A = this chain, B = another copy of it.
């Protein structure tokens, strides 16, 4: 009688977040005290940056897609206590100060927990905690065209800096760390959130876990 962990990985702009968000919307799970399906984001677990790390982040020279940018120790400790059925405190990152807010999110033992992140399967110890591993596979240049429109129309970034960072940081980090972990996935979901047959296949299964 433990929480069912489902790990979700894939490249940036592949549709991870929309896939998981569509699942819980489809179940209807959005009371936080009594919710049975919950979503954890790797983005919650960014390390606290030093003043040298803060300063390069302003000049765009920090690599937020590198595994060194994330608190693997915290992620493992948080996800182990979740499989042990405890309540855990999820950090709330303040990107302005590039540190953690003292205030923190409280998540209770849910029957199924979704953990989505680009490097979710990177660490083996974290990787063995997942009962089910899902990989959102969409084409490298399809993902790029999505990320470019997101960063301009939603975040208002400069086009050249977008593409320069993608080639310097995002692309290598995905090819060196993320994509090597595709083989660890039990089930591969192509094309992301538009793939409704795959989403409904996952949706029903979570209810069967919720039903019994």
Contact = CB atoms under 8 A, between A and B. Distances in A.
B187 A176 contact: no
Interface in A176-212: 176, 180, 182-183, 185-190, 195, 197-198, 201-202, 204-205, 208
Contacts of A180: 175-176
A56 to B, nearest CB: 19
Interface residues of A, number: 39
A122 to B, nearest CB: 14
Given A149-B163, A159-B159, A190 B197 contact: no
Given A132-B197, A132-B201, A145-B166, 16 more contacts: A141-B141, A141-B144, A141-B171, A144-B145, A148-B148, A149-B159, A149-B163, A176-B180, A182-B190, A186-B195, A187-B187, A187-B189, A187-B190, A187-B197, A187-B201, A201-B205
Among A132, A139, A190, residue most surrounded by chain B Cβ atoms (within 10 Å): A190
Contact of A137 (B175, B188, B189): B188
Given A141-B141, A142-B171, A188-B190, A159 B148 contact: yes
Contacts of A66: none
A140 B141 contact: yes
Interface of A: 131-133, 137, 139-145, 148-149, 152, 159-160, 163, 166-167, 171, 175-176, 180, 182-183, 185-190, 195, 197-198, 201-202, 204-205, 208
Contact of A198 (B139, B140, B163, B187): B187
A159 B180 CA distance: 28
Given A144-B141, A188-B189, A160 B149 contact: yes
A188 B201 CA distance: 12
Contacts of A152: 159
